[PDB]
Design a protein around this ligand. Structure first.
Ligand SMILES: Cn1c(=O)c2c(ncn2C)n(C)c1=O
Length: 291
């Protein structure tokens, strides 16, 4: 009951943390910028983790008996939260790029309305993708619980060709490669901005301070994304060995859970990364707790 204990420990933090973030934003209007609209999507997504995803993960670990629709939803619900985080992290990257790249058109393009729109779309696409195995791409009953109910086991009910080709490479590796490519242009151009301002006949510390603060935000965003890939790659890398290399000793269970726990931990690092990186956030939380 140790794995269970740790999974519950995370669920608590994942909730308290991200919920604290959403509350801090709804309280302090200085954090209600268009940018943080996506951060809210990240929070809500990472909240349902300690709310449903973890509970489901703890249940499916031992396996149970249920229909295909019910057994798939429970097993593929984590793919939805993990996929939504992809769109949110990708949007934030693009956003932090638009600001530094074209500061003027930033307010003209990056609107509070389009934000809510994109988010909605992202979630829809998250359910479409995350629950693709429920569209027919599954191994329900492929060569106990009785007729009608199927032994709900993640590896047995969920195809490997999906989580590898479709899910991992396309819906994870590609995005992360796009995001990484974005931050490449972000910091590459950001340092050029400082070089042009390094050869200016005027102080203009307003533009420098602002530029440095926009870079501080883009950097903080880069750290949030990095921890995502750092906490999900291991779990996918394991599935790459199992699939592509049937000979390669199938990953043990003790190692399997560690990769799974590492993914559920990702939802917790965010609340703490804001309180540290952003001096505006930490002062917001500090107040809520006291009062
Ligand atoms: C992504 N993933 C897995 O790849 C997995 C798993 N249990 C077993 N495997 C293989 N769980 C709960 C999971 O979330």
């Amino acid at each position: 009951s140790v794995y269970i204990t740790v999974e519950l420990a995370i669920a608590v933090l994942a909730i308290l943390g991200n919920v604290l973030v959403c509350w801090a934003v709804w309280l302090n209007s200085n954090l209600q910028n268009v940018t943080n609209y996506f951060v809210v999507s990240l929070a809500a997504a990472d909240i349902l983790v300690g709310v449903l995803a973890i509970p489901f993960a703890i249940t499916i670990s031992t396996g149970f008996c249920a229909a295909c629709h019910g057994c798939l939803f429970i097993a593929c619900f984590v793919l939805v939260l993990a996929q939504s985080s992809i769109f949110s992290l990708l949007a934030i990257a693009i956003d932090r790029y638009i600001a530094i790249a074209i500061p003027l058109r930033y307010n003209g393009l990056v609107t509070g309305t389009r934000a809510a729109g994109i988010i909605a779309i992202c979630w829809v696409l998250s359910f479409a993708i995350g629950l693709t195995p429920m569209l027919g791409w599954n191994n329900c009953g492929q060569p106990g619980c009785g007729e009608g109910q199927v032994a709900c086991l993640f590896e047995d009910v969920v195809p490997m060709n999906y989580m590898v080709y479709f899910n991992f490479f396309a819906c994870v590796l590609v995005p992360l490669l796009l995001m990484l490519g974005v931050y490449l242009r972000i910091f590459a151009a950001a340092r050029r901005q400082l070089k042009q301002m390094e050869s200016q006949p005027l102080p203009g510390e307003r533009a420098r301070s602002t530029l440095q603060k926009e870079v501080h935000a883009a950097k903080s965003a880069a750290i949030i994304a990095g921890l995502f890939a750092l906490c999900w790659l291991p779990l996918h890398i394991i599935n790459c060995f199992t699939f592509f290399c049937p000979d390669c000793s199938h990953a043990p269970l003790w190692l399997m859970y560690l990769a799974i726990v590492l993914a559920h931990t990702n939802s917790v690092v965010n609340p703490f990364i804001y309180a540290y990186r952003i001096r505006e956030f930490r002062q917001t939380f500090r107040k809520i707790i006291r009062s």
